[PDB]
Design an enzyme around this catalytic site. Sequence first.
Site, PDB file in Angstrom:
ATOM      1  N   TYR A  33      30.024   8.821  -8.981  1.00  0.00           N
ATOM      2  CA  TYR A  33      30.270   9.685 -10.132  1.00  0.00           C
ATOM      3  C   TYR A  33      29.150  10.708 -10.326  1.00  0.00           C
ATOM      4  O   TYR A  33      29.397  11.910 -10.365  1.00  0.00           O
ATOM      5  CB  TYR A  33      30.431   8.834 -11.393  1.00  0.00           C
ATOM      6  CG  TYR A  33      31.595   7.860 -11.350  1.00  0.00           C
ATOM      7  CD1 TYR A  33      32.875   8.291 -11.629  1.00  0.00           C
ATOM      8  CD2 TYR A  33      31.408   6.520 -11.074  1.00  0.00           C
ATOM      9  CE1 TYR A  33      33.927   7.440 -11.620  1.00  0.00           C
ATOM     10  CE2 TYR A  33      32.468   5.652 -11.061  1.00  0.00           C
ATOM     11  CZ  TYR A  33      33.723   6.131 -11.327  1.00  0.00           C
ATOM     12  OH  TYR A  33      34.783   5.286 -11.306  1.00  0.00           O
ATOM     13  N   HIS A  43      14.316   6.798   4.792  1.00  0.00           N
ATOM     14  CA  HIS A  43      14.142   5.559   4.033  1.00  0.00           C
ATOM     15  C   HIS A  43      15.031   4.457   4.600  1.00  0.00           C
ATOM     16  O   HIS A  43      16.242   4.457   4.378  1.00  0.00           O
ATOM     17  CB  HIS A  43      14.482   5.809   2.559  1.00  0.00           C
ATOM     18  CG  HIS A  43      13.843   4.871   1.584  1.00  0.00           C
ATOM     19  ND1 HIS A  43      12.557   5.030   1.117  1.00  0.00           N
ATOM     20  CD2 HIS A  43      14.353   3.816   0.916  1.00  0.00           C
ATOM     21  CE1 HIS A  43      12.290   4.083   0.236  1.00  0.00           C
ATOM     22  NE2 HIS A  43      13.361   3.331   0.100  1.00  0.00           N
ATOM     23  N   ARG A  95       0.826  -1.202   0.000  1.00  0.00           N
ATOM     24  CA  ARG A  95       0.000   0.000   0.000  1.00  0.00           C
ATOM     25  C   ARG A  95       0.867   1.263   0.000  1.00  0.00           C
ATOM     26  O   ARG A  95       0.357   2.370   0.166  1.00  0.00           O
ATOM     27  CB  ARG A  95      -0.927   0.020   1.222  1.00  0.00           C
ATOM     28  CG  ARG A  95      -1.241   1.479   1.781  1.00  0.00           C
ATOM     29  CD  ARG A  95      -1.986   1.545   3.127  1.00  0.00           C
ATOM     30  NE  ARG A  95      -1.094   1.261   4.239  1.00  0.00           N
TER      31      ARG A  95
END
Lengths: 432, 433, 196, 198
Positions: free
Chosen positions: A112, A68, A24
């Site tokens: 990079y 996160h 969800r």
Amino acid sequence: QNMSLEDIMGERFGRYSKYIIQDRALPDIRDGLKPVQRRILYSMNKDSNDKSYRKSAKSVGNIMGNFHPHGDSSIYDAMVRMSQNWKNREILVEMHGNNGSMDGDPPAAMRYTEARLSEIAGYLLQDIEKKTVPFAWNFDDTEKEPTVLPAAFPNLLVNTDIPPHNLAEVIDAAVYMIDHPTKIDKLMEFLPGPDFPTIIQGRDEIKKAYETGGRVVVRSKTEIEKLKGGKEQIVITEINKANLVKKIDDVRVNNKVIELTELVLNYLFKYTDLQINYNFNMVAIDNFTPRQVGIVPILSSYIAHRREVILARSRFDKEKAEKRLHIVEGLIRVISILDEVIALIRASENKADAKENLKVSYDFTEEQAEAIVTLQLYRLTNTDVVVLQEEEAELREKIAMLAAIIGDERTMYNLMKKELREVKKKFATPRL
Amino acid sequence: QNMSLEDIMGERFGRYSKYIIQDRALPDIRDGLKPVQRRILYSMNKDSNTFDKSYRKSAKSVGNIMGNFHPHGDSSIYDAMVRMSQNWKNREILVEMHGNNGSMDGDPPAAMRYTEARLSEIAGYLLQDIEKKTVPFAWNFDDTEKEPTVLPAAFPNLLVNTDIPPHNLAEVIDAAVYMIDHPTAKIDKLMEFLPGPDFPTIIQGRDEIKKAYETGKGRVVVRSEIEKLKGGKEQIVITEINKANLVKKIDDVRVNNKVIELNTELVLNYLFKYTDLQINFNMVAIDNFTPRQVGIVPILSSYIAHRREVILARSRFDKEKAEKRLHIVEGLIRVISILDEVIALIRASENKADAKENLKVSYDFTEEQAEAIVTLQLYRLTNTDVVVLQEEEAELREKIAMLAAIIGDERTMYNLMKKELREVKKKFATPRL
Amino acid sequence: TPAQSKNPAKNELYLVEGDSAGGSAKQGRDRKFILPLRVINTAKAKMADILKNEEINTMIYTIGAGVGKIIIMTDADTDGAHIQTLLLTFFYRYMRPLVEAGHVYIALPPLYKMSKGKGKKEAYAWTDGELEELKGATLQRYKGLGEMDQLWETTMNPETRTLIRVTIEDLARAERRVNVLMGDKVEPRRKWIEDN
Amino acid sequence: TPAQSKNPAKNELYLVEGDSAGGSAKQGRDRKFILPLRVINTAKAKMADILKNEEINTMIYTIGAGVGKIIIMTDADTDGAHIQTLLLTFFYRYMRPLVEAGHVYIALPPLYKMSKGKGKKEEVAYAWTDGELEELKGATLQRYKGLGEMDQLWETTMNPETRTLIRVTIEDLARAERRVNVLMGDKVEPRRKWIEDN
DNA sequence: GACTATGCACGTAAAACAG
DNA sequence: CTGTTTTACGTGCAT
DNA sequence: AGTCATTCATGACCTTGGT
DNA sequence: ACCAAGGTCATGAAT
Ligand SMILES: N[C@@H]1CCN(c2c(F)cc3c(=O)c(C(=O)O)cn(C4CC4)c3c2Cl)C1
Ligand SMILES: N[C@@H]1CCN(c2c(F)cc3c(=O)c(C(=O)O)cn(C4CC4)c3c2Cl)C1
């Protein structure tokens, strides 16, 4: 001891529930973003990224460690994606070198790449500033997080699969819907169908799809010309030029059907996947749960859910004004007795004993007393004699104005129109 | 066009120069740290991660090291980092992590995805005075922030960690003291404090270490008990080497049987010097901003003088900051006298600017003098400072004399450096080994 | 690839998540009288497909048995579920007795943990009710089978918090576990999620 | 693994650093009428050793020649040197003519770059951030990190080597003496010793 | 999220060298 | 099958 | 610094399936 | 070699 036991009729129900409720975290009907996005767009914001290119490891790092839990290259990997202007409509982040080829082009690690937030990108984060969108805690409980950016740009229908469009169709409609809430037939007039960054057949089909929540078609940008010496030359300039560049050469290896009849190209175009496509299966999360929506639901939930967004903009800002005009309205009134107060505060004792002691001279309040007691000796220049006077009606006008946006159902919309019109310019996606 | 050409007699000289001057980022005789370290220990600092506070993740801490103070790629950065987590590789771990540091055996530590760590106490020591204009400081590579060129370091990390053998803060300060009050010192008397280098994980070669301490190079030796197993048999087993290839080297000895709770003890003597079960000190780093070899006396040497300039800077600023304080005070007091006139002067003055100037009269106060007066903020028109400030004049003035004393006194200076180094020998206080 | 062994006395063969966990277990084996797992959905392909899976096959290699206390540590990661889910299904549709016996079951990692006193040193399994028994100090939260010596707080004691599986399963449950995991035909799964 | 080709007319075979560069070249080939390099010190082991090196071998595979405009792009990384150093030595001690001809040489990447106006583009560039940098407040400057970052890529790419370097030019003998004092690695004592001009 | 190769030195502990 | 030079193996910080 | 395997749907596109 | 059920492959975001 051996702790308890439990049914695998038991354990494999409750586990797989957890994992399904984590199904969800899909793109909200509103923000038009999937969390590992919302998080990434806001980590960029918070950090202030106009300004120069920020590296990666740092920007990801920071995304991937304050907003996160998951691992790194789920975080960034995603990020990149938002760099690919040939995957989205308005890239919500601009990187540089090497984003990724239309062909199999492995982008380079966080070592990079360097990138930063995009203009268009702002739109959607253009009012977290105040108590706009509804806001929750971190996972580490360290900072706090937004639950779906408030978003000007209807990223949801401009980017469970949801086909690209164009800000232009999307606002133009969005307007129509407002002033005319209650057919999808008239509403397709503004959006004949979904726009891909990279011509579609299936009019009838899109038409039904917009309410049904279908299958369309997609044709390549290749034309015809005549090569030197008198021969044929017909070649090409959300698909993938990786397997298409080879599918031609494969056709040519068996010769079972390119500046080398034109009916032959018609047969190759629907066989070599050179003009496959597409599907439109519109589906996301509404009301904090998974539902399928259409062309009218999307604008629908977004108009109402944006409506609560513009109203909050009022809620605070007005709040902040009132708070200002009462410090002013205070600070002015001070001038009158500037001499008595500047004497009162001297004798008063400790700082605390001073603001209390401002019971007399006036019926001023704590918040009233505060600023007075912190008014800082420079500003004992009474420059505010006439000015502040002007303020009382300045901040008072904004106070009426914002409160007006709160009572007026019709005027509210006019704000949302002006703004959305505004991005359609500033941003202004070309047609396609 | 095709631009110019050039000798490979030319190109391969000038290139390889660049790359060799980048072979001069080796551990400084002073900080006892190699840049991709110094950077890592200061990124941690700047960000506030002391022993005190909570564990920070990685990707973020590295990330931040590896993108504001270190061009190179990521896992050069962190990889290194980890190292500093391994208490079985250093003496005082300069960073404490948790949750797969690394085995004594082949134990691949986990990426930045998992690990979490933060700065160590001991670790502070070395960064315990960047606070002021202690160590000499330069620009970023991006020219974004600025960087230290070698932390100032209390703890002589250089001889406590081109290879330089571990020791113990305890030997190292104890000596370090001796050297101070007695500069000119034989290495014979100085080995009395440090009989030799300490490894976290007994060494043979007394004579050898003894010569090595001045020679800057040499070879020592390293040694890894016995008991009787039930039923009447032998049982002699073990608990900067590597338990990876040692755990197998025994079993290898046993596969060929060509020489362990398993009948002579002489056999163990033969295995210990063959199976690498009990298998150098080549002291060398960078001094004066160039590569040299040093010894046991040069190290303390350059570090005592180079720490000496570190303690003197501590004085330079702090004293500077005091003077600056005592002149705002000495000002602010004097105000009280004419608090009533100035509080009237400032009102009429016009704009803010016109106000501080206009404080030409009433007193001969200075800009920096005038400033604070003009920003003295209306609360503080409580003259609490009537008697207090008075006391300040001699408070900040005492510190002003004190610090300036550290600047003139060559003998008193040392006494500071002794007190401090003694201090870490406690606070930290490495056990012997 | 496992973490060695000893005597087949009490069996004992823990499965961890990801080489990091299985590393933290292997070096921390305060209790090995281990094997990393990087697991297919058993009922999702051909039995031949399944034997072609390094993951399935590995597990079949270590400890023989064949199709004719093995504990599993996950994390807390809702992501850490789906990795309990398959394991148990891959211990069911194959190696029925293994669980049916109930020798081989599934572990209960830790959650919130409290710690105070900087340099003065000084845990729980439900950060819900159980968390309330524990300002002034400082709290924590468990990220996964990552982080965690400590590791053997769940390790050293014989499964101070272990779970015994399959207990009185019975039939008609096979019906359900091929409604959910397996991945029926879409329609069933969207449908079991009418209690979610 | 290379980036395709065409006609042997002007040859043209650029070598970049790391799959990222060689990626940025391959997709950006605003000039391919490419091959990543992840390079041993030629004079450092057995000739058999050397042929066992995927790196050396690869280079020998592409373009035949054998022991009997091939340009090399590095970066600016002092680390980017050492990777020029071996390449050239590996183009010397083997494939002598390749350079001796001078068809195959070494590239000059960019350095500092200026850019201003948020959303108004307007950029610049330069090849020496020393003297050349002075020709370029109000605006904003930059600094080049490596053959990383950089479409742009073909600012060094598209024009025929607007800043290319021709190698080996009038080498001669007695230079082989030196290039086996420095790079090869000699025997310690020589190398510590060439660094008395450093 | 662990695989895989290399420079750079400096040890020395293991292959190959001859008849 | 001896003693010899030659060869590979490992370790931090980089690509 | 790119390599490698899978979940989890959902499709259009390539394998065997039989004789 | 026909047309049909089966088997594959690709795609983000997570491990
Ligand atoms: N089999 C291959 C040869 C090439 N290679 C590479 C490679 F190609 C790139 C990197 C790399 O970017 C890196 C970092 O800075 O993040 C760290 N390392 C090392 C710590 C592992 C890299 C390695 Cl080993 C090994
Ligand atoms: N059997 C398989 C081979 C591939 N694979 C793994 C693996 F073990 C770990 C990760 C991983 O941690 C990660 C991340 O978020 O940091 C991202 N990826 C993918 C983006 C590349 C991983 C992959 Cl593919 C193991």
